Amino acid sequence: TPILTFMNKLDRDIRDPMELLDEVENELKIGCAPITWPIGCGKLFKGVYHLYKDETYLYQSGKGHTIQEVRIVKGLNNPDLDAAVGEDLAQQLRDELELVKGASNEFDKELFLAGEITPVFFGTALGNFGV
RNA sequence: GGUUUAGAACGUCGUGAGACAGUUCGGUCCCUAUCUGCCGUGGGCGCUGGAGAACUGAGGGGGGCUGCUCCUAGUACGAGA
Numbered sequence: 001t002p003i004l005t006f007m008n009k010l011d012r013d014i015r016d017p018m019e020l021l022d023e024v025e026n027e028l029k030i031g032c033a034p035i036t037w038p039i040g041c042g043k044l045f046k047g048v049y050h051l052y053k054d055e056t057y058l059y060q061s062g063k064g065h066t067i068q069e070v071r072i073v074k075g076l077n078n079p080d081l082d083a084a085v086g087e088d089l090a091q092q093l094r095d096e097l098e099l100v101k102g103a104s105n106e107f108d109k110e111l112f113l114a115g116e117i118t119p120v121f122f123g124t125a126l127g128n129f130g131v
Numbered sequence: 132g133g134u135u136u137a138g139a140a141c142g143u144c145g146u147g148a149g150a151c152a153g154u155u156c157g158g159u160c161c162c163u164a165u166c167u168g169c170c171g172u173g174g175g176c177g178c179u180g181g182a183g184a185a186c187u188g189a190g191g192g193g194g195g196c197u198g199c200u201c202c203u204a205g206u207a208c209g210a211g212a
Contacts, residue, residue: 011206043206062204126205 003030005118008125010059013042017122018096021104024118031117033107034100036130038122039085039093046085048122048130049076049093051100052107056081057129064128 007020014020021032036048039056047059056073073081076097082090111117123130 011204013207043203061206062202 002112002115003118005032005120006125006130007038007120007122010038010041010045010048010122010124010130011127018099018103021120024120030115031105031111032120033105033112033117034120034122035107036120036122037093037097037100040089044089045124045127046089049081049097051097056085058084059124059127059129061127064124064126067128 005024007014007017017038021034024030025032034051036050036057038048039046045059047057049056054074054076056076056078058071058073060068060071073084075081076094081093085093105117107119108117112119121130125131
């Protein structure tokens with residue numbers, strides 16, 4: 001049976017999402033294919049950058065009861081991602097994404113249906129963001 | 132209202148008058164503020180020619196309480212709660 005993976009609780013101070021990928025591949029014996037990627041966590045959760053759509057959905061704090069306003073920032077090197085997220089966090093997104101590409105997987109529909117890779121989504125079910 | 136006067140009764144002590152830091156019902160609380168003090172409010176004279184305004188500010192006084200909710204965030208902390 002195929003497995004989607006959702007990394008919940010990005011409102012909280014969490015572990016390194018890199019390390020989180022290791023624990024999922026190593027201990028669950030299944031490949032990880034990131035679809036989105038968190039930008040900051042805890043008090044610094046700013047949203048997720050979508051790897052395949054190449055855009056950035058911006059998290060707003062405490063709209064967990066309804067659906068928040070979908071607020072996108074288009075480019076991964078769009079200088080508005082720097083403005084909206086702070087250029088510091090913006091580069092760490094860029095850095096991590098570099099490492100991610102050298103140590104992860106492209107989502108393949110065939111291997112997902114074979115139960116050999118999981119599409120990993122990062123989000124927060126409480127903030128109603130990522131769902 | 133209590134309690135300390137005078138009336139009356141109970142228990143109680145005493146032959147008794149009376150008595151009890153025992154109880155019970157009743158039972159006159161004056162003052163026109165001279166001074167100090169304090170709240171206000173004027174008059175005088177001063178401040179150096181006499182006036183009409185507007186000021187500066189040495190000082191002085193007043194004020195100074197706090198609940199609950201929401202954002203942060205059900206975040207940090209926490210196995211959870």
